[PDB]
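Reopening: structure tokens for the BO2 complex, inputs below.
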Amino acid sequence: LAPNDPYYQEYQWHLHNATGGINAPSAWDVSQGEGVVVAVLDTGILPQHPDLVGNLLEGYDFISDASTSRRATNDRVPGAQDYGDWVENDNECYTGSVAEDSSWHGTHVAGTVAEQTNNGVGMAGVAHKAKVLPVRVLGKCGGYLSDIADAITWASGGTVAGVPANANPAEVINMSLGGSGSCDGTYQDAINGAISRGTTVVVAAGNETDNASKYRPASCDGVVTVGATRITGGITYYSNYGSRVDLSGPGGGGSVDGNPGGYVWQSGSDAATTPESGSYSYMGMGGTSMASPHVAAVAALVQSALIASGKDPLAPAAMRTLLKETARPFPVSIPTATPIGTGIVDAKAALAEALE
Ligand SMILES: *[B]([O])([O])[C]([C][C]([C])[C])[N]C(=O)[C]([C]C1=[C][C]=[C][C]=[C]1)[N]C(=O)C1=[C]N=[C][C]=N1
Ligand SMILES: [Ca+2]
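Re-run output (same inputs, fresh job):
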């Protein structure tokens, strides 16, 4: 499938480039992810983005701190509206931090997963007939482990005290988020719960040019840890590495690769603070954050295709095995001391092997 989205051909190398893309055009002849739900645990979403409307569920906001959520109370509430995670001053978050505009990171990531495709608008997405379940866990200066842990539980169909039962348990969780430290019991237990319910958990390796073993949830057991490659098919300057990294997806090499080649392109906003301070747009972002949702979406394509053939969905361990075994070996040599898994996720190869 060559979809008709106006910016797809020029911008979205990460979908269709022969060295650095995930073989999406061929995959899309087989599956678009229909009937699957991917939970995006992130900064929230702009739910009326014209290129997302139709592929989103209401979701929920798990941030239990008014200052972080920019909401009026510390309550968790239905919906996942991103209120903006901007920070006006240097050093507000940690000693050393610098002021940043609102990321709309969750809307970008959600676009990689399920941006409306072949609709003659904006950009394409990978699992563009799936639904995204947005689960807002990050706000101003980030979020809290307890919020993220309960979000994992709820997203995967587990019970959380204080939140109504999830009517849309997700086959796949994407966490384009993390921080320093080995995986603790809190993360690991929530993740083990999701896995026990059949949910595959896909996470960003991190962007510290460091061993993924030193970060969480990257270093958690049972997860798919995703490094980042360039348009060239080689390691990005920022990607974390190590034996824990399972495979890579396109994350974008940044300025060395230019515009558009250095960035992944999806739905977002130019708003600097509140949603109202800007308008809907398409944004180019780089990171393991962008790589992870390509892999989460491919998982969704696989689960969907199987259901369509009346076959059983893959258990998490099988999904991770399939993603690794079917990845495209890197077209550029990866240095021995910075491994980033078995290859670049290959949407077509994954589908072909699952349907054999
Ligand atoms: B990514 O953008 O590549 C990245 C991956 C992560 C595993 C290191 N995600 C983040 O940095 C997320 C989302 C984000 C929010 C705002 C600006 C840019 C990105 N954030 C976090 O995980 C986070 C944020 N603040 C504190 C701690 N962690
Ligand atoms: Ca589109």
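The radius of gyration is 18 Å. The chain is about 25% helix and 15% strand. Marking as resolved unless the reporter disagrees.
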